[PDB]
Amino acid sequence: DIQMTQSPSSLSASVGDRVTITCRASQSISSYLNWYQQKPGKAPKLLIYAASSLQSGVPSRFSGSGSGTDFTLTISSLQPEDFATYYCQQSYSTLALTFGGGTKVEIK
Amino acid sequence: VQLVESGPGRVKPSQTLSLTCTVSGDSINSGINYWNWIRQPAGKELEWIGRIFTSGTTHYNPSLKSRVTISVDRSKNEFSLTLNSVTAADTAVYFCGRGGTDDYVDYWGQGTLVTVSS
Amino acid sequence: TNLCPFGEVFNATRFASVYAWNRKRISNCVADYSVLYNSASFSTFKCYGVSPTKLNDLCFTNVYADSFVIRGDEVRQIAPGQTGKIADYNYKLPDDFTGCVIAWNSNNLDSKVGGNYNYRYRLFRKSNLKPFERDISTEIYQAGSKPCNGVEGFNCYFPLQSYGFQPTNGVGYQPYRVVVLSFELLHAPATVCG
Amino acid sequence: DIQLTQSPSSLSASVGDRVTITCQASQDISNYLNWYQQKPGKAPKLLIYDASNLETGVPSRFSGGGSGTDFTFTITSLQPEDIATYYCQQYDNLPLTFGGGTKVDIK
Amino acid sequence: AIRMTQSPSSLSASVGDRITITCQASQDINKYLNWYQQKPGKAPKLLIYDASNLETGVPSRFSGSGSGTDFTFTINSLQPEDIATYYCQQHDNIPITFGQGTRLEIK
Amino acid sequence: AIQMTQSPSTLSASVGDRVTITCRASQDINSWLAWYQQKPGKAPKLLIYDASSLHSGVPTRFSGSGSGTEFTLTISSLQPDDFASYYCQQYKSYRTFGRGTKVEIK
Amino acid sequence: VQLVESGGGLVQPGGSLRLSCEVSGFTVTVNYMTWVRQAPGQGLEWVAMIYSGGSTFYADSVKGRFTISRHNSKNTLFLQMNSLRPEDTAVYYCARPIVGGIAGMDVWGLGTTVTVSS
Amino acid sequence: EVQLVESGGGVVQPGRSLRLSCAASAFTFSSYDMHWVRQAPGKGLEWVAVISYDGSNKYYADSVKGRFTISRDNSKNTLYLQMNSLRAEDTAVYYCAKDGGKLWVYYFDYWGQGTLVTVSS
Amino acid sequence: QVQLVESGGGVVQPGRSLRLSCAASGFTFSTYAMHWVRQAPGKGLEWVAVLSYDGSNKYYADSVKGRFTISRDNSKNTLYLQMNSLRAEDTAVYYCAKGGSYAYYYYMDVWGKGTTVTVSS
């Protein structure tokens, strides 16, 4: 399969900070990366699809970029409702969808 | 591909029958070719003796595995068959042929008659 | 538009060797995409870049079916970004491959009691294949300074090695028939709609 | 190199007749044969690919067949716009060699 | 990884006796097992390849057999120059793994 | 080994008739069958391989059908050039030939 | 053929050492080449492998730290070792392994001793 | 507005059978592919299976292939997942997710709250 | 719309050199192989050369091998043929054909219009 590795595995930031999360694939996955957000005890919510397109209903502060094996999720201004776990998933191998390890954003 | 059979046609029993197939028009040490020896007794059906690949690997009919040795002289661009412990039942017409697969033979030689008698 | 000849590709009695893999071009026909995966015989179905459930609603310009036979343990090498002997010297898929790889166990057909030597793979090569490149030359491989002169000796090897296929081999050493469907959609009008 | 021999090198038939060309290869090329039609002054136009399949927009009268070394190309109903030179090409291995050509005329 | 279990780790005997070394693969490795000989302080030397084929120049008294998971390495007539360490190695499945090893001593 | 039983032993036919020759394998051979034609005193000529594929240069009047343990060589319109011996060879395990079928003039 | 290992010795833990393997009798750039280590008192252990085309494979215990490469100008095999550990103290051999069951192909070097200790 | 509600979970002995259901509303259920995705307790997400809009094609992950069965009923707008011969690794929270459909590749956009399946005895 | 336009043909004295440039449009030129083919006046079609997607592997015909050089510029989306030591037999019409996917030299799906090269004094 294609292994997805997220950096950092955990980070601490306050409200108003700019947060960047890096996702790396074992092999090239073109531009088929999805970013999901999950709160503790809740269901995951799609934030980014195709590594650049913003899902409807998602705040505009979330952005995604990258290609090949390196992708980046950026939150320009962190807010109290943005503290959750962010997952990256590759859709290149459509029949072998794999998620990343997760990146738990915490409060400093 | 042209294949020509040569060899003594009056071999004696319990001796070693040797036949040589000269190949012209195509190389024996290049490409994917399966050089086959096939024999036919008079009034009987065909019998596949064996094959050799261009890498030297040989394959034999299990009934004749212990008595058949097929070699290739790449200097002369020929391949030869040696059948030892020959009895009276080995008198037959021997053909050599080329085959692109290990399945069938699509080119054949004129064939040479080999008689075994004392 | 008639039906695409997927049945000929998948139900062909004889499959090519991995070094001389067959390729068939498919265009100007109606494709039974969702009907290809109806049997349970496929032991490996992996799509890259296209969803197999979205093929019936997609129009392509060309569909290229590359068919061959490999070992079971080598089926994992038919994928983008793989390395090994099959991926480097026999059949290479590009990193941005858009298609589907379908492999199934053919121990009944491609495996004979005495050994099936019809299937061969390139064991030696000075460099790795570029994507979708076929190398069929049988030139003797020169591993030393002395030229081989078309004869195998010391530091001179025949580049093609055969899978001795027997019905007693383990599933990792049993023959597997592999068909790779590559979907090409250029600016030209599409003619292989579902 | 692979040698392609066409037969006949030139033939003439009445409109509506069945025109048949044959292409023989010096070695097995599976089904890797293209049939091209070239009118004087214009670039070759690919009519048949894979020795049996028709290119997009090719009229159904043109047909191909054969596998291995012998291949056949057929025009079932000759038309005034089918007067051209017909070539067979192999693409089993480099170099990609064409046929000798076949000039078609009207009786 | 494929774990090779070579037994026994020591089968000290006298000159002229028969030697039997058994190697077991965790998975199926078909026939791709190599038996190597190493003198104390010397580089290993290939004795048997593909579990039944003698190498070039190796004395015929060495032999091998078996396919699948279990393999056997036999010395028909033990000799003073055969006192070394014998390993079994599967080479067609990355990672390549050697056996435990068998120390042949003199009794 | 695999034994191929070919029938009929001798077949009488006229020019233009439809000839059918059957071959039966002792065990399952899938579609790995070949058909050869041989003239008296000449080398055999390959007609069919894979039990259905026509050899290049063979006239189209020859057809091969069947699979498993039953195979058939059929000549739609017989011709004088087709009066010879026909052999079926399996290659499921090594290569074994059938005893052949002779087509004579009636 | 002659394979000569060099560049070993003693190194502090965490250091980097470059083992060289000079080769005579065959071209390094077009051959399969393996590095195999043996710990003092222990058995053999495969470390690294490089194919004819340049594909490299490493053991799990050494992946990400060892790197096998080739040099055509000097016809030398190279093994770069970074982040060395006490368990890496061993004798390393460069070998041309037998590929495809071709007899007469296998040849090992003399071996170089690497001691990782403080 | 998309509503997905999972049900049918609980404690199941190893090797037994459990059928999970997912009711869908506020969208055209018969026009989108539907995925089942599980998350182990304290671990990350894991895609399980996918079914097509007409139910003709069903695909499964390697760990669940030949062991699970995903089906759908467009008349009732329901998605069913039958799990047979459950192992200890299958204890997780299962979510039914809707496929976005805007790309040639799968990607989930709306998830249900999920139901817990505990493989223990 | 795939288009291949040749240019650079003209009258060139024997023994000189010429450069033919084929501009590609309507497709990703940087990923496809390319062929040069030629036809002599009144004769059949002769294949000249082929080039891979990255330009690393080049193949020629015996009649031109060691005499012509085929190259490409993916940034400019062009395919160049340099003809040195021109003989009278090189007078012909040259077409550039689109090749296979990446390193498939066995396809000529799209041909160009061709340019005329007349080698005479």
Numbering used by the authors:
A (entry chain F): 1 to 108
B (entry chain A), G (entry chain H): 2 to 119
C (entry chain R): 333 to 526
D (entry chain D), E (entry chain L): 1 to 107
F (entry chain B): 1 to 106
H (entry chain E), I (entry chain C): 1 to 121
Task: Reproduce passages from the article.
The spike protein (S) mediates cell entry by binding the angiotensin-converting enzyme 2 (ACE2) cellular receptor, and many neutralizing antibodies bind S.4,5,6,7 Mutations in S can therefore impart two important selective advantages: firstly, mutations to the ACE2-binding surface in the receptor-binding domain (RBD) can increase affinity for ACE2, potentially increasing viral transmissibility. In this report, we generate a panel of 25 potent mAbs (IC50 < 100 ng/mL) from vaccinees suffering breakthrough Omicron BA.2 infections. The BA.2 mAbs segregate into 3 adjacent clusters, two of which (left shoulder and neck in our anatomical definition of RBD topology) are hotspots for the binding of potent mAbs against early-pandemic virus, while the third cluster, which we term the right chest, spans between the neck and right flank epitopes in early-pandemic responses (note that in the early responses, right flank binders were not found to be potent [IC50 > 100 ng/mL]).
It also contacts RBD residues 346, 444, 450, and 452, explaining its similar variant neutralization profile to BA.2-13, with neutralization seriously reduced or completely knocked out for variants containing the R346T mutation and by BA.2.3.20. Overall, it appears that mutational change in SARS-CoV-2 since the emergence of BA.2 has led to mutations that knock out or severely reduce activity of almost all BA.2-directed mAbs; only BA.2-04, BA.2-07, and BA.2-23 did not suffer a complete knockout of activity with any of the pseudoviruses tested, and only BA.2-07 maintained full activity. Note that most potent IGHV3-53/3-66 antibodies bind in essentially the same way (although a second binding mode has also been observed), and yet they vary in their sensitivity to mutations. For the recent variants, a key mutation is residue 486, where the change from F to V has a negative effect and the change to the even smaller and polar S side chain is more deleterious. The N460K mutation also impacts the binding of this heavy-chain family. Since IGHV3-53/3-66 form a major public response in SARS-CoV-2 infection, it is likely that BA.2.75.2 has acquired F486S and N460K to evade them.
